[PDB]
């Protein structure tokens, strides 16, 4: 009911990001949307004078035939002044269960900061480039800008003070337009409370993380090995050397004097099962020297093993993997790459938000042209990390499968 | 009198930090003088400027060529940034037929839309006095002045908000507004067309605005943008191609400008080997030869551009249909329309700069760029006809490092067809010799060898002047290749050669990379296999290359 003041950094201008082309469906979809919302005082029409842009598009999310509005605030987040915090929940990746709930309408009940407000323009824009497009601003606070979780969190604390004071084991962690509900009750209770929880926040997505763990480097169980099983075995060895330090293949290496034919069996003499055995005890134990900073950006690889399977790598520091995953999950996507590759985006990000309170940094296994031609058409999240792309194919890939 | 509805000013503002523009008069001749008195005194008693008093510090110079011409480049530094009046030009493929288009000039509404009055007194301006014995006239603009940076976008949205409930309210008409002159297309029958155009008339005349009652110039064809705009149709105002005895760089430049300005209607078109001699040139007036291949290109291009190509304009009601052709030397080109025979429009494609390529990323980059291009001219994306065999593209994408995808398209067959040219084995062969290859060179004498070690007991060394690591470890594989059977197993420890064949190039740079490529075409089953280097894998030999 009161506006908070917010300003940008200093030395820096508004954003100014030109606005993708959109299909006529999402663009009209838009109008139905913004003409709404315009009734609804929430965005007001703007003039020649706000030189500023964001872009917009549409998507549909999950279980919803209805079109829902996406804003791309990641620039203006970048350039808004840092918000202050509260320390990151470290216990909500340790319970059993998490649900997730879309809590950015109550967002639209706070008024923006009217100075600020022209740095929230967006364009609808038009077929074949016949006008300028529609032009709007936000008049609340708008859904996916990193200021509106901070101004809104007094009055969250406030809705949410009577149910955590009624149940201290449930831990809720906000993170945008996402309210995370962590619990270690059975799904049934877990649902109605849940529903308990929606009715309460009225009045003013199943997640598991017990069942994710990190994943350690495997070698083969063989009672007979040809000279290629050895060669991608020491090939295998030798990039777990530079994970772990008292790796060691000389004597695997031993057996591969001379040359042989690949399919060829050779048998492990015993100072090779003992290399072998030594290096499964070195593979059994945590990464030395492991740590979270804060200060530092999350990195996140993912490589595409095929057969709808994708693994992935979170990590700060190189042979400091934080987090390792396999996603092979398989929903309307079968003949898709794309959509898997956006869908594993997604999920990756969301434990990361889970587990550090922030997105990390995507290196994809796409050429820039198809992904940014495609991604949209199937992104569901109210957030946008960022990602870069790899054109030289790692091979390291087969290690990781 | 009528009373005029005012029109909502646009509040302006400087460059943060700025001042306004102070810029010292130019001295006038007499009769220069004696004209713009007089203009200013007409367009004072019109109102478009207004007298102003001393303390006004600003300034900005005004010329006469009479006709009056206010120089604000210094104003228009200092002046804040707009939203654009435009975000790029439409295409005539994106427009829809209309039974009738109407065109009404709204040149004398620019003068008519005021501007912000805290932001008259930087548009301020002298006429210097006869012999300089008097203080010069001082004037201010009430109204956007022409050459201000803020002109057109505030008097395109002061239009678009008036004409908006007009439009709103006539859907069966086409309102468009492009510099002064708006655009009036409909299906209704003619009376009631220029029926509704009175009723524009009107609705304008509301805000005080004047269309003239004149028969306008504008009339079919329409000639706009280096494009005719027809009642049924539109293409490109004609292409000629000049007959030179010898080409210089602004020759060949211009050449290349027709062509690609051609391509989007007439297809076939290509540019590479004309577009091949202006490589690192940037010398205007050099004059280059022709090879005979741009020959060859241009008697090609002369043959499509001997006669007119017309494009249809969209039918919202049909499907939208791209085909793609590939031309060769990474060229290809590519079709749109929704009826056989009658193109909306045309285009080409050429492929990016790189080291390694194929025609499968080729094709699927030309399709992206035309799904692009499609998005923008008429909001959706075409159904498309591709070269490919459904078979090829399941094999490349389910076996791609990458992912990829190409929207819903249908295999066409018209030579030539892209193809995968080689497959490797997953799993070592069983039967096929094994080659143990390496190769290594060193940094100074730049002298190397390559060779290979197999199970069978052959072996090969060869020694190389001129050439790197790289080189002999690539040398090596091809040397592997050249003296195998049609199914073989190759071991390497080059992480550069593996991160080369395992991007599947179909052609190169690289003369050594094409030879491999040849040889792997040549084979029925290769299997690369990767080991690391000085781990004492036997077979792989750093020794006997290093000699
Ligand atoms: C605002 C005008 C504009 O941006 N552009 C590119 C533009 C369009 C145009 O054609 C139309 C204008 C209004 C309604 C409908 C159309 O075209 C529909 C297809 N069509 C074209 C021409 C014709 O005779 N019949 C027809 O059905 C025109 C004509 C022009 C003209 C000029 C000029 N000079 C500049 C921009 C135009």
């Given at each position: ?215 350690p480097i495997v070698l083969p169980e063989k009672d007979s090995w040809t000279?290629?099983d050895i060669?991608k075995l020491?090939?295998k060895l ?14 695997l ?14 048998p492990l003499?015993?100072?090779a099962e003992l290399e072998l055995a030594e290096n499964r005890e070195?593979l059994k ?117 | ?547």
């Amino acid at each position: 009911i009161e506006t908070v003041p917010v300003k940008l950094k200093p030395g820096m201008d508004g954003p100014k990001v030109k606005q993708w082309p959109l299909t006529e469906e999402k663009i009209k979809a838009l109008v139905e949307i913004c003409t709404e919302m315009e009734k609804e005082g929430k965005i007001s029409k703007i003039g020649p004078e706000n030189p500023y842009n964001t872009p917009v598009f549409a998507i549909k999310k999950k279980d919803s035939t209805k079109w829902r509005k996406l804003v791309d605030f990641r620039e203006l987040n970048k350039r808004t002044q840092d918000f202050w915090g509260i320390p990151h929940p470290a216990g909500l990746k340790k319970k059993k269960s998490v649900t997730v709930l879309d809590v950015g309408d109550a967002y639209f009940s706070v008024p923006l900061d009217e100075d600020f407000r022209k740095y929230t323009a967006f364009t609808i824009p038009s077929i074949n480039n016949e006008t300028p497009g529609i032009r709007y601003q936000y008049n609340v606070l708008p859904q996916g800008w990193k200021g509106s979780p901070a101004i809104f969190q007094s009055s969250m604390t406030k809705i949410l003070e009577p149910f955590k004071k009624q149940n201290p084991d449930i831990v809720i962690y906000q993170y945008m337009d996402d309210l995370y509900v962590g619990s270690d009750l059975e799904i049934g209770q877990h649902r109605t409370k849940i529903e308990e929880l929606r009715q309460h926040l009225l009045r003013w997505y199943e997640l598991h993380p017990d069942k994710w763990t990190v994943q350690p480097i495997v070698l083969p169980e063989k009672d007979s090995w040809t000279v290629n099983d050895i060669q991608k075995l020491v090939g295998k060895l030798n990039w777990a050397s530079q994970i772990y330090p008292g790796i060691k293949v000389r004597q695997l290496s031993k057996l591969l004097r001379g040359t042989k034919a690949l399919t060829e069996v050779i048998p492990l003499t015993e100072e090779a099962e003992l290399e072998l055995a030594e290096n499964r005890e070195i593979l059994k134990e945590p990464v030395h020297g492991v740590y979270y900073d804060p200060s530092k950006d999350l990195i996140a690889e993912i490589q595409k093993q095929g057969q709808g399977q994708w693994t992935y790598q979170i990590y700060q520091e190189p042979f400091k993997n934080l987090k390792t995953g396999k996603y092979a999950r398989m929903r309307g996507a079968h003949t898709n790459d794309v959509k898997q590759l956006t869908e594993a985006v997604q999920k990756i990000t969301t434990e990361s938000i889970v587990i550090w309170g922030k997105t990390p940094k995507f290196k994809l296994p796409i050429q820039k042209e198809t992904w940014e031609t495609w991604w949209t058409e199937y992104w569901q999240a109210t957030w946008i990390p960022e990602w870069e792309f790899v054109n030289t194919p790692p091979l390291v890939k087969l290690w990781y499968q | 009198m009528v009373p005029i509805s005012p029109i909502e000013t646009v509040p302006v503002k400087l460059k943060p930090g700025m001042d306004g523009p102070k810029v010292k008069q130019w001295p006038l001749t007499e009769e220069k003088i004696k004209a713009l008195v007089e203009i200013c005194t007409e367009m004072e008693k019109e109102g478009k400027i207004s007298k102003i008093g001393p303390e006004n510090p600003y300034n900005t110079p005004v010329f006469a060529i009479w006709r009056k011409l206010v120089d604000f480049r210094e104003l228009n530094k200092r002046t804040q940034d707009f939203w654009e009046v435009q975000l790029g030009i439409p295409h005539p493929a994106g427009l829809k037929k209309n039974k009738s288009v109407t065109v009404l000039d709204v040149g004398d509404a620019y003068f008519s839309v005021p501007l912000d009055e805290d932001f008259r007194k930087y548009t301020a301006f002298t006429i210097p006095s006869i012999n300089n014995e008097t203080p010069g006239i001082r004037y201010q603009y009430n109204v956007l002045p022409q050459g201000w940076k803020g002109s057109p976008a505030i008097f395109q949205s002061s239009m678009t908000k008036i004409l908006e409930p007009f439009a709103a309210q006539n859907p069966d008409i086409v309102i468009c507004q492009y510099m002064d002159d708006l655009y009036v297309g409909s299906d209704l029958e003619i009376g009631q067309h220029r029926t509704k155009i009175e009723e524009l008339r009107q609705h304008l005349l509301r805000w005080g605005l004047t269309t003239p009652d004149k028969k306008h110039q504008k009339e079919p064809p329409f000639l706009w943008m280096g494009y005719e705009l027809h009642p049924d149709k539109w293409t490109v105002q004609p292409i000629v191609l000049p007959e030179k005895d010898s080409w210089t760089v602004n020759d060949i430049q211009k050449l290349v400008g027709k062509l690609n300005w051609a391509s989007q209607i007439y297809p076939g078109i290509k540019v590479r080997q004309l577009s091949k001699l202006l490589r690192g040139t940037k010398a205007l007036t050099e004059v280059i030869p022709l090879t005979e291949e741009a020959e060859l290109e241009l008697a090609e291009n002369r043959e499509i551009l001997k006669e007119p190509v017309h494009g249809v304009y969209y039918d919202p009601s049909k499907d939208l249909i791209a085909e793609i052709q590939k031309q060769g030397q990474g060229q290809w080109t590519y079709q749109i329309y929704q009826e056989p025979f009658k193109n909306l429009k045309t285009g080409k494609y050429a492929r990016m700069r790189g080291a390694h390529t194929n025609d499968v990323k080729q094709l699927t980059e030309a399709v992206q760029k035309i799904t692009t291009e499609s998005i923008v001219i008429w909001g959706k994306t075409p159904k498309f006809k591709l070269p490919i065999q459904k078979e090829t593209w399941e094999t490349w994408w389910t076996e791609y490092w990458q992912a990829t995808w190409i929207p819903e398209w249908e295999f066409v067959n018209t030579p030539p067809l892209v193809k995968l040219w080689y497959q490797l084995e997953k799993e070592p062969i069983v039967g096929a010799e094994t080659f143990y290859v390496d190769g290594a060179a060193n940094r100074e004498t730049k002298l190397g060898k390559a060779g290979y070690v197999t199970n069978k007991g052959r072996q090969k060394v060869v020694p190389l002047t001129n050439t790197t690591n790289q080189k002999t470890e690539l040398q090596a594989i091809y040397l592997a290749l050249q003296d195998s059977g049609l199914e073989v197993n190759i071991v390497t420890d080059s992480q550069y050669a593996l991160g080369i064949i395992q991007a599947q190039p179909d052609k190169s740079e690289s003369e050594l990379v094409n030879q491999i490529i040849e040889q792997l075409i040549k084979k029925e089953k290769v299997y690369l296999a990767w080991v690391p280097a000085h781990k004492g894998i036997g077979g792989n030999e750093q020794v006997d290359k290093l000699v």
